[PDB]
Amino acid sequence: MLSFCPSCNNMLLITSGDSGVYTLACRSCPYEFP
Amino acid sequence: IEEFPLKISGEEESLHVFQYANRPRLVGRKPAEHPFISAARYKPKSHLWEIDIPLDEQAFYNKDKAESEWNGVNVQTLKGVGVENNGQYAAFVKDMQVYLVPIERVAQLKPFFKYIDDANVTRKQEDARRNPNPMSVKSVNDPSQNRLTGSLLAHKVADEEANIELTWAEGTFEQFKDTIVKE
Amino acid sequence: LSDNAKTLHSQMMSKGIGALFTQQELQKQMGIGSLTDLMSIVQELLDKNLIKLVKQNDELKFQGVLESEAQKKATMSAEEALVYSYIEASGREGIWSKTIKARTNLHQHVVLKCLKSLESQRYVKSVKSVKFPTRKIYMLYSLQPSV
Amino acid sequence: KEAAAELELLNADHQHILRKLKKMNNKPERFMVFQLPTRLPVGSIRVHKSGKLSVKIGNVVMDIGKGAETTFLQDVIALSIADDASSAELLGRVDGKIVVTPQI
Amino acid sequence: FLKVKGLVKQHLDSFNYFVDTDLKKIIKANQLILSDVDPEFYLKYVDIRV
Ligand SMILES: [Zn+2]
């Protein structure tokens, strides 16, 4: 869904965040976004 | 009517061209910048290019996942294989002159994930440490048996060769005027 | 050159054959030469076929043998020495003529002619097994029939 | 028919490439790559009547066609290596890419 | 057309290309019969004719 992770263009992934927050962050790359 | 004479004064310098598949050329009609190379890395006889780049800090970084998983920070390498072809000279343009030099290879830069490749090396190391459970004499080449060659033999020779950490500079007026003074 | 090789195999003769040697002790044992010249005389001594390449598991290891049985196998041509090397590497349990044919690529005539010449030179004896009978197992004259 | 859509675009290619040839006269460490036809059986980029370019790179061998044609959303940078030593310098980025093709 | 180049083009011009050229590309891919016993013996096929 246009989920490009810049500097790798790989993917994004809704990850289980702190206090249950719905953060999105991919593997194989140190990246995060609200 | 008008005519712009070109001549070919370039030798002795096997200059390469890269292609960043990650960063765009222009951003909202505005031309972008190139990121600053920390150091370069070149493998002769296999023509690889492990260009290192830094990625920016905590604000868009998420170090708490980067530190605890692979313990490798602030370094994003990207592998480029040197591919050769004919034609395709490189031209810098003078006022009513245009001066050519041959391009030796064109390598294409893909994001080489180094740290999570190596995160399974200690994981493979710890496999046989939790499960430790356990003579080199010559033989003869037989003419009814074959040996590996071609594609997979070139990967056996491209992992073990000399590292070179390149002193990356940005000069190039020495390369310019040396070409200008030669006809 | 050759005088340091006379000091090198003295260290191989210094210890009784067990407790097999390796380089990280041998560099501390002998460090008068740098490793650019230590390796060159050992490869020359591999060409003087007195040092062998033993394997302790997964890593690098050496073993030096007696000279009195090194000239024994240097009497043979390289094919007879090729079958002799595997047949002492088993040693304690023996080898089967099919296994000694597989690891060398020598086909059925050139291995059967090889050991027949080797038996006249008193270098291989033939025993029959009991854990699997009707199979030809060969050994040296060490006489180690643990089966 | 649709071949008449081609020649008018090749006219619109020359008027876009004489612009980028002329804005880069200020030698501002600017590079461009273009391909020459090898296997020869030097010359001069030159303007004809009413917007037409050609090169004649042999003694006689004319190459009429040129075209400023490709699309790349990439970063492309030229570097010169020398003898695998302290020989790493980024020369410049690449603005455009044209091609040369002989007429038949 | 049919004088220089008849009606059994497809049969005659195929076998005639096999005999002339397409035999020499066979023995050049099965040359050098060898033995492992007595390794100084070699027989090679240089060329072939019908
Ligand atoms: Zn990513």
| Cα B114–Cα B116–Cα B118 angle in degrees, nearest 5 | 70
DSSP-H helix ranges across chain D: 4-22
User: How far, in Å, from the CA of B105 to the mean position of ligand 1?
Assistant: 29
| Residue C60 to residue C55: CA distance in whole angstroms | 7
Residue count (chain A): 34
Tell me which residues of chain C have a C-beta less than 8 Å from any C-beta of chain E.
Answer: 105-107, 109-110
| CA–CA dist C23, C11 (Å, integer) | 12
Q: 3-state class of D80 per DSSP?
A: strand
Calculate helix-pair angle for C78-90, C108-120, nearest 10 degrees: 80
E36 touches chain B (CB under 8 A): yes
User: Nearest CB to B137: which of C57, C89, C105?
Assistant: C89
Distance from CA of B145 to the nearest CA of E (A): 12
Contact between chains at A30 and B116 (C-beta distance less than 8 A): no
Q: Give residue A29's domain range.
A: 1-34
- How many residues in chain C? 147
Return d(Cα B2, Cα D54) in angstroms, integer: 11
Q: Which residues contact C145 (CB under 8 A, 6 or more apart)?
A: C127, C139
Instruction: Considering only CA atoms, give the Rg of chain E.
Output: 18
C-alpha–C-alpha distance, residues C127 and B151, integer Å: 47
Residues near D7 by Cβ (< 8 Å), separated by ≥ 6? none
Q: Which residues have CB under 8 Å from A3's CB, separation 6+?
A: A11, A12, A13, A24
b/e per residue B156-177 (b: at least 16 CB within 10 A) = eeeeeeeebebebeeebeebbe
Instruction: Please determine, looking at this structure, whether the domain spanning C69-139 carries the CATH number 3.40.50.150.
Output: no
Q: What is the dihedral of CA B17, B21, B26, B28, to 10 degrees?
A: 180
Q: Are the CB atoms for C50 and C70 separated by under 8 Å?
A: yes
* Domain residue limits, chain D: 1-104
Beta pairing partners, C138:
C95, C126
- A8 assigned binding-site residue: yes
Residues with CB under 5 A from ligand 1 (ion): A 5, 8, 10, 26, 29, 31
- Give the single-character DSSP code of D34: E
Cα dihedral sign, B21-B25-B27-B31: positive
- Written as one letter, the residue type at B61 is Y
Distance CA B55, CA A31 (A): 10
| Euclidean distance between CA atoms C36 and B47, whole angstroms | 29
Is A3 marked as binding a ligand?
A: no
Q: How far apart are CA D68 and CA C134, in angstroms?
A: 82
- A7-13: long-range pairs with CB below 8 Å, 24+: A7/A31, A7/B22, A7/B23, A7/B53, A7/B55, A7/B76, A7/B111, A8/B22, A8/B76, A8/B111, A9/B21, A9/B22, A9/B111, A10/B111
CA distances B100 to B8, C114, D63, D73, Å, are: 5, 68, 17, 24
Using CB atoms within 10 Å of the CB of residue D49, give its burial: 0 to 12 exposed, 13 to 18 middle, 19+ buried.
exposed
B56-68 in b/e burial notation, b at 16+ Cβ within 10 A?
A: eeeeebbeebbee
Method used to obtain the model: cryo-EM
Entry resolution (Å) = 3.7
Contact D68, D20 (CB under 8 A): yes
Q: Which two tokens stand for residue D84?
A: 């695998």
Can you tell me the distance from the alpha carbon of C97 to that of C92, in angstroms, rounded to the nearest whole number?
A: 16
Helices (H) and strands (E) in chain A, counts: 0, 2
Domain count, chain A: 1
DSSP letters of B4-37? EEEEE---S--EEE--BSSS-SEETTEE--PPPP
Do residues C79 and C112 touch, judged by C-beta distance below 8 A?
no
